[PDB]
Design a protein. Structure first.
Ligand SMILES: *CCC1=C(C)C(=O)N[C@H]1Cc1[nH]c(/C=C2\N=C(C[C@H]3NC(=O)C(CC)=C3C)C(C)=C2CCC(=O)O)c(CCC(=O)O)c1C
Ligand SMILES: *CCC1=C(C)C(=O)N[C@H]1Cc1[nH]c(/C=C2\N=C(C[C@H]3NC(=O)C(CC)=C3C)C(C)=C2CCC(=O)O)c(CCC(=O)O)c1C
Ligand SMILES: *[C@@H](C)C1=C(C)C(=O)N[C@H]1Cc1[nH]c(/C=C2\N=C(C[C@H]3NC(=O)C(CC)=C3C)C(C)=C2CCC(=O)O)c(CCC(=O)O)c1C
Ligand SMILES: C=CC1=C(C)[C@@H](Cc2[nH]c(/C=C3N=C(/C=C4\NC(=O)[C@H](C)[C@H]4CC)C(C)=C\3CCC(=O)O)c(CCC(=O)O)c2C)NC1=O
Ligand SMILES: C=CC1=C(C)[C@@H](Cc2[nH]c(/C=C3N=C(/C=C4\NC(=O)[C@H](C)[C@H]4CC)C(C)=C\3CCC(=O)O)c(CCC(=O)O)c2C)NC1=O
Ligand SMILES: C=CC1=C(C)[C@@H](Cc2[nH]c(/C=C3N=C(/C=C4\NC(=O)[C@H](C)[C@H]4CC)C(C)=C\3CCC(=O)O)c(CCC(=O)O)c2C)NC1=O
Ligand SMILES: C=CC1=C(C)[C@@H](Cc2[nH]c(/C=C3N=C(/C=C4\NC(=O)[C@H](C)[C@H]4CC)C(C)=C\3CCC(=O)O)c(CCC(=O)O)c2C)NC1=O
Ligand SMILES: C=CC1=C(C)[C@@H](Cc2[nH]c(/C=C3N=C(/C=C4\NC(=O)[C@H](C)[C@H]4CC)C(C)=C\3CCC(=O)O)c(CCC(=O)O)c2C)NC1=O
Ligand SMILES: C=CC1=C(C)[C@@H](Cc2[nH]c(/C=C3N=C(/C=C4\NC(=O)[C@H](C)[C@H]4CC)C(C)=C\3CCC(=O)O)c(CCC(=O)O)c2C)NC1=O
Ligand SMILES: C=CC1=C(C)[C@@H](Cc2[nH]c(/C=C3N=C(/C=C4\NC(=O)[C@H](C)[C@H]4CC)C(C)=C\3CCC(=O)O)c(CCC(=O)O)c2C)NC1=O
Ligand SMILES: C=CC1=C(C)[C@@H](Cc2[nH]c(/C=C3N=C(/C=C4\NC(=O)[C@H](C)[C@H]4CC)C(C)=C\3CCC(=O)O)c(CCC(=O)O)c2C)NC1=O
Ligand SMILES: CCC1=C(C)/C(=C\C2=NC(=C\c3[nH]c(C[C@H]4NC(=O)C(C)=C4CC)c(C)c3CCC(=O)O)/C(CCC(=O)O)=C2C)NC1=O
Ligand SMILES: CCC1=C(C)[C@@H](CC2=N/C(=C\c3[nH]c(C[C@@H]4NC(=O)C(C)=C4CC)c(C)c3CCC(=O)O)C(CCC(=O)O)=C2C)NC1=O
Ligand SMILES: CCC1=C(C)[C@@H](CC2=N/C(=C\c3[nH]c(C[C@@H]4NC(=O)C(C)=C4CC)c(C)c3CCC(=O)O)C(CCC(=O)O)=C2C)NC1=O
Lengths: 177, 277, 164, 164, 177, 164, 177
């Protein structure tokens, strides 16, 4: 579990030298950014439930074979396990948004997920499809371009940050496959 | 001045001030210091005492029950320092996956402590003497400790459970590396629970996945989640857990017997099934 | 590492919750205290050499018996080691100063230091003489800002109060 | 209660450390975010009556079938029960808003609400109609300060995202 | 475990009404105080080891019966148990200083300590004397009038806070007896 | 206490067995080694005073900086304390020597000594100078019997190797 | 668990001085005794099971209410628990014989036994009767005057030891009542 600060520190410790102005300058870009990341995490964590519902319902909508008998979503038990999985994934994505580094997402959620789904016969393509939908929904909330709910916030540039969150979803979607 | 009631519950003053006639020894054993306990939040401290007594005020041994509580909660703190050492919470103490789970966890643990109190006297005597004997074997000739285990019933039980948690030598924190250790480990656990209950009828307490309706499924889910976190562990953690489980289960259940000493050192997950408690 | 955001994310992970406004206010306090202690980090990366030099020179100025021939530091290589050790300590103060918290310092320097220092006949009072020398030579206005300096004081005191 | 300073003290207490600089910055962020939330708390204690009244009136404006004689809310006493329950909700939003975090609200309002509402044939979507009515009727500059408003938005959203 | 905030909230919840404007004013005295409390906690937690050592050493200094054989300080084991007890006491006091309420100290440490010392034969008078020495040393550090170490702080009035800390130590000293 | 008969009875108690011939042979070795250790115990109770006196005098003969005004032992009362501390140590060597094993010494002297000595700025090398002084001043034939002397050496070495 | 040795040491530690000659002389009587105690423990530990069988059978013989329905010894399970209790009693008594002090017997077995039997309804007078029969049988084996088994030993006086073992059985029988 390492934030962007601990990432700076760890890299300088492997280099075995002091911190210094260059790395600190990039870190002052992070700290100077600040409330854009705060508000972003507030947006995704606010509408989290609804993201998970829509994403997984869309995932069932593209291929109805999951709800077909013999599909992995055919029961209430398997549907429940499905919903909690999407929820946990979005949870750890938000953790990786506050941290600024993907260490918590790599250690706490990603470490042994591929093996697990393969052992349980979960189709990985359908999971990457749901991670993609959560990506689009999460970027749309994070840019406040969501077509249902549009709350007042200071207007500036928040594209970088969108690219960060897209990086995290692409990490998960790349990992599950 | 006060009441008849409250003067039963109160306290005793000094021989020079509060009472003239010099009180005898029995009145210190019968009235004295009167404090009833808190409702207890773990199965390890649940069946040892009274918790309260409406219309009775005991004295001088309630000092001891209060002392066992405070030493026992002092026990839990340290074995929880082991899982949270660097002030950041490790994956050991996560306590949920979904957002609403932890309260249901709290209630399951609580009523499990109440069912631990409902099980009869002969069984709880059995577990007191068993755990006492077990703490004396883990005392390692420390004489202070041995006094403080012959007297404490709660500190023994949380001492065992607590050390089984912080050593990590648990049945659920160790995953076997083979199919042979799967079947061996499974068989050992079965034989432990069959040694506990030969009646063939489930006994109040024990496993007990179901209290209210819709409990069993959450039990299944929390179990599988803890299996996944047990799966994700590092090299250091795994190797430390295996040495610890092999040694500990040898010290408790292998008595210079080369067969079982061999089948503990050979397969550590069987030992971790042998740890029980 | 122990820090603000790792304590809050670790507590939300141990609780199994989404990160609420409490963690947001915690990282708010992190991003508000940040600039001060990073300034102190800049100046520590500035003149660490003279810090280590005056630290070790005053350390043997207090304890002369170390260069006597019992006690350990009685060879040029081990005085190089004592200096090397103090350089590691100031580098850990820089690291934990950048991080925020004592986590980098605690897990690299403090954890298990008792058995090593007790084993290799190393007295702690020499280290404490070094750190208290640096803390007395510190400054209020001239080199640093006062506020950030307080952060530096805290970290250095933590080292002393983790040593003896 | 889950809050900033209780999370940090709780983390230090569980770990058994003295309170390091990380907790100090966390409570620094608490004391910086505090005024914005407190002011929103003042205004909520101001006009809670009209908040509950418009909330429930718009709630039955969306769902008429509740006052039909199947479904629960079909008598004057149970429509009274509607308004007092929404009143409970706004008071918990005030509590949690003052504390900082969701600890007061979560442990009093959310924990085990699913069994009660599911048992007594209470739809969650009627509550969510009420809260989303209040969240859409909210405001940016007119009643509140923008910043504080955000804190209120968060709390209300939290209730919705804890409810369904 | 309850801070200032939670204490006000609990009292308003028993009263069953909204927190209101008035309580919030006393809470604005807390928030408006702020970094006085921060710097104060930093002072006590800075010199904490040294406080524990001096207080227990002073306690042995007033009556050398403790280090006399049969005394409760007579051995290395009992001495160590003595010092860890002083340390944990100081620890919870500092917790109560950041919290603003004594709830953490009442629940986590105070609840059953008396009976414990009674059952171990710890002399309670000597413990209240050690709590008193830690009180005096801690107030002297918190006011920065300590005779050995005197660090730079921007000046002001910090008597209130010292009275709070004195209140916490008098709670412990009243509790151990 | 850790001893022969307490190890065997403790092992039989942990095992839940009757005491077989193995424990009988163990206590046979106890009652055969007993005379050598007991004789050493007699002579230690004979001249413990001069043992402590030469021990501490040679201890400050090696380390002079202790009576300098930094380091601890710079006052008459604390030199009295260093002397009493070494008298406790020789008494524990006499106790453990009479018991058989290191149990008496380990649970009174060694257990928890690290916190105390590390706390109160007490260097171990002064103790080791004292004990190694006694062990080098010891003797082969003139005061004691050789074999019992070896027992004494072992116990004193145990103290050294439990200290640093 | 304290033997003869640790009893001498603890008493000298309360006295706070060196062990001394007088206590060492009594200890030389113990060690000089030695293999009489070894051969004594060998005798009782040899015939132990048979002592327990005979003593419990005699105990059922004096009052047949035990084996009467509603008696404690009614059924196999209670009889098995009876036999293992007599066996463990004799086991700790033999531990007290090798130890030379009753500390093992006071700490490991005696501490909370009367309360236990009162909580289970075990008749205490019958237990003291069983301890009395184990006392007489154990003294008769320890003097090698048993009417069934008489093994060859080098002759001499074992009378002093027999008083010790009788003192331990009187401690157990006094404790159970
Ligand atoms: C160790 C306790 C124990 C012994 C001994 C034993 O024989 N079996 C258990 C108690 C037991 N448990 C059940 C019933 C259920 N137990 C679960 C929980 C598991 N199922 C899962 O999927 C998982 C996660 C992978 C766990 C932990 C469940 C879901 C049930 C069935 C619930 C229901 O609605 O019926 C029983 C009764 C069944 C039986 O074994 O006869 C017993 C005795
Ligand atoms: C190393 C800790 C420390 C620093 C640094 C410092 O400047 N002084 C101490 C803390 C300190 N101690 C007190 C107060 C008292 N300390 C003692 C204990 C000593 N007095 C003795 O007689 C002995 C034995 C010889 C010892 C160990 C006492 C008795 C007091 C006064 C108690 C009272 O009731 O007031 C103080 C406060 C005074 C000050 O120095 O300003 C401080 C900061
Ligand atoms: C594992 C041993 C843990 C260590 C070490 C530690 O410091 N605390 C443990 C992990 C931990 N648990 C929580 C949060 C909650 N834990 C709950 C369960 C208990 N509450 C109960 O009432 C009962 C039954 C009596 C139990 C077993 C509950 C509930 C919570 C709060 C849930 C919530 O919604 O917030 C935490 C986080 C809180 C903290 O200690 O900082 C941690 C780290
Ligand atoms: C985890 C849950 C849990 C409980 C609920 C209790 C239940 C409980 N109570 C007692 C024991 C007791 N409980 C009471 C209480 C009573 N006094 C009266 O006048 C009333 C009838 C009643 C209070 C309403 C008394 C008096 C005893 C002691 C009984 C005795 O020794 O005679 C015991 C036996 C052990 C002991 O002596 O403490 C147990 C298991 N214990 C637990 O571990
Ligand atoms: C040679 C003699 C000798 C002793 C006497 C012991 C004494 C001793 N105990 C502990 C350590 C310990 N001792 C206890 C015991 C306690 N649990 C409680 O609830 C009670 C208060 C108490 C029993 C009465 C516990 C719980 C620990 C571990 C403490 C922790 O890690 O938090 C340690 C530190 C090393 C370790 O973790 O094992 C030592 C030296 N060790 C020795 O070598
Ligand atoms: C897969 C690996 C595997 C093992 C290694 C064993 C280990 C093991 N042994 C026992 C159980 C047992 N093991 C022994 C063995 C012993 N008798 C003695 O005199 C010696 C000390 C020791 C042989 C050297 C005895 C006697 C029991 C029964 C104990 C009792 O009921 O009192 C039990 C409890 C269940 C049972 O009663 O069988 C288990 C799990 N079982 C397994 O499944
Ligand atoms: C990451 C942080 C970090 C540290 C802080 C150091 C700490 C440290 N120092 C030494 C080791 C050493 N440290 C010193 C230093 C001392 N000489 C003296 O005269 C003084 C008492 C003192 C300087 C103030 C010496 C002399 C040794 C070698 C000791 C020996 O071999 O006898 C060792 C053992 C390995 C080695 O030999 O290098 C370690 C771990 N190492 C680390 O990795
Ligand atoms: C601390 C917070 C807190 C709350 C938020 C409430 C929540 C709550 N409401 C009810 C109970 C109720 N709540 C309502 C309310 C409703 N009527 C309708 O037409 C609508 C759907 C809805 C208002 C929007 C009704 C009608 C009942 C009674 C239900 C019944 O008895 O059928 C109950 C069960 C106990 C009771 O009967 O009062 C509880 C716990 N209570 C609390 O303690
Ligand atoms: C994260 C860690 C952290 C801290 C440790 C504090 C440190 C701190 N203290 C003050 C500021 C201050 N600190 C004190 C404290 C006192 N003055 C006295 O003379 C007494 C000795 C002592 C009693 C406690 C005072 C009086 C002020 C100035 C008044 C005030 O700002 O309220 C300030 C204001 C800014 C400045 O002065 O530059 C800050 C940041 N705040 C933090 O965020
Ligand atoms: C049962 C065994 C047993 C011991 C072995 C001692 C060990 C011991 N010594 C001290 C305490 C002390 N011990 C010394 C001794 C020293 N002075 C020096 O110059 C030398 C380095 C050293 C003698 C060789 C001193 C000076 C103190 C007081 C330290 C201080 O207060 O600064 C203390 C703390 C309590 C006290 O102040 O007395 C303890 C537990 N005590 C015991 O109960
Ligand atoms: C390792 C196992 C082990 C044992 C079991 C004992 C066995 C043992 N007993 C004696 C020796 C003896 N044993 C007894 C014992 C008694 N005689 C009586 O007539 C009584 C019936 C009985 C009471 C206990 C006596 C009296 C002696 C001789 C006197 C003595 O040696 O003190 C001797 C001396 C050597 C010899 O006789 O050849 C030995 C080795 N010692 C051991 O090392
Ligand atoms: C100091 C004790 C300690 C504990 C208790 C700990 C972790 C821990 N184990 C826990 C649970 C938990 N751990 C165990 C462990 C266990 N099972 C065994 O057979 C043995 C011998 C065990 C001891 C290691 C059980 C039975 C449970 C109850 C089942 C359940 O609740 O899922 C909990 C509670 C919440 C959760 O389920 O995660 C926690 C917080 N880490 C520790 O250090
Ligand atoms: C008929 C089967 C079916 C569905 C079910 C949907 C599911 C769906 N939602 C999307 C994407 C999507 N979904 C939402 C969330 C959603 N919108 C909101 O404004 C609110 C309040 C929401 C929760 C209630 C958002 C915010 C987006 C991003 C697009 C947008 O701006 O609306 C996308 C686009 C995916 C992509 O970009 O790759 C799909 C496929 N589509 C289907 O064909
Ligand atoms: C009818 C119900 C009944 C019994 C059952 C017995 C039980 C019994 N055994 C005794 C005593 C006793 N028991 C034995 C042990 C026993 N004898 C042996 O030689 C061997 C090999 C034994 C185990 C198989 C010995 C050795 C003695 C001592 C007397 C003797 O020398 O035989 C005594 C005398 C107690 C005393 O002295 O106070 C009694 C009462 N008596 C009864 O009335």
């Amino acid at each position: 579990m390492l934030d962007a600060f601990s990432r700076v520190v760890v890299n300088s410790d492997s280099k075995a030298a002091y911190v210094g102005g260059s790395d600190l300058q990039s870190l002052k870009t992070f700290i100077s950014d600040g409330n854009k990341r705060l508000d972003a995490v507030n947006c995704i964590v606010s509408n989290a439930s609804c993201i998970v519902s829509d994403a997984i319902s869309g995932m069932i909508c593209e291929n109805p074979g999951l709800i077909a008998p013999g599909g992995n979503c055919y029961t209430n038990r398997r549907m429940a396990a499905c919903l909690r999985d999407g929820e946990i994934i979005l949870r750890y994505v938000s953790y990786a948004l506050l941290a600024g580094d993907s260490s918590v997402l790599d250690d706490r959620c990603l470490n042994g997920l591929k093996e697990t789904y393969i052992a349980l016969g979960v189709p990985t393509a359908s999971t990457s499809r749901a991670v993609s939908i959560m990506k689009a929904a999460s970027t749309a909330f994070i840019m406040n371009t969501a077509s249902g709910r549009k709350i007042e916030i200071a207007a500036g540039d928040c594209q970088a940050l969108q690219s960060e969150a897209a990086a995290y979803f692409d990490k998960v979607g790349s990992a599950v496959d | 001045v006060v009441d008849p009631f409250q003067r039963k519950f109160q306290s005793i003053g000094k021989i020079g001030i509060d009472y003239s006639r010099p009180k005898k020894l029995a009145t210190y054993k019968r009235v004295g210091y009167s404090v009833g306990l808190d409702f207890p939040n773990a199965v390890s401290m649940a069946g040892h005492y009274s918790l309260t007594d409406c219309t009775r005020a005991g004295g001088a041994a309630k000092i001891l029950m209060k002392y066992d509580e405070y030493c026992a909660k002092g026990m839990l703190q340290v074995y929880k320092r082991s899982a949270v050492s660097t002030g950041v919470y490790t994956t050991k103490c996560t306590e949920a996956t979904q957002p609403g789970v932890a309260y249901d966890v709290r209630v399951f643990n609580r009523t499990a402590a109440f069912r631990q109190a409902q099980k009869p006297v002969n069984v709880r005597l059995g577990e007191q003497y068993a755990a006492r004997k077990a703490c004396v074997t883990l005392a390692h000739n420390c004489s202070r400790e041995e006094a403080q285990f012959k007297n404490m019933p709660m500190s023994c039980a949380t001492f065992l459970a607590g050390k089984m948690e912080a050593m990590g030598t648990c049945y659920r924190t160790v995953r076997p590396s083979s199919k042979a250790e799967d079947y061996m480990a499974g068989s050992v656990r079965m034989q432990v629970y069959q040694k506990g209950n030969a009646s063939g009828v489930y006994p109040v307490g024990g496993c007990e996945d179901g209290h209210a309706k819709g409990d069993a499924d959450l039990r299944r889910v929390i179990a599988l989640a803890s299996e996944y976190r047990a799966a994700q562990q590092g090299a250091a953690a795994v190797t430390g857990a295996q040495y610890a489980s092999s040694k500990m289960a040898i010290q408790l259940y292998g008595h210079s017997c080369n067969h079982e000493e061999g089948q503990f050192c050979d397969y550590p997950a069987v030992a971790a099934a042998m740890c029980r408690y | 590492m122990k820090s603000v955001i790792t304590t809050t994310i670790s507590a939300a992970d141990a609780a199994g919750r989404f990160p609420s406004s409490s963690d947001l206010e915690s990282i708010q306090g992190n991003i508000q205290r940040a600039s001060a202690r990073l300034e102190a980090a800049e100046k520590l990366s500035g003149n660490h050499e003279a810090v280590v030099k005056e630290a070790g020179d005053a350390c043997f100025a207090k304890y002369s018996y170390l260069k006597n021939s019992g006690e350990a530091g009685d060879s040029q290589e081990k005085i190089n080691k004592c200096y090397r050790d103090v350089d590691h300590y100031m580098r850990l103060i820089n690291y934990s100063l950048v991080v925020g918290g004592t986590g980098p310092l605690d897990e690299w320097g403090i954890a298990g230091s008792r058995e090593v220092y007790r084993t290799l006949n190393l007295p702690g009072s020499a280290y404490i003489a070094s750190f208290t020398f640096t803390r007395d030579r510190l400054c209020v206005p001239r080199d640093m800002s006062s506020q950030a300096g307080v952060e530096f004081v805290a970290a250095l005191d933590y080292v002393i109060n983790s040593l003896s």
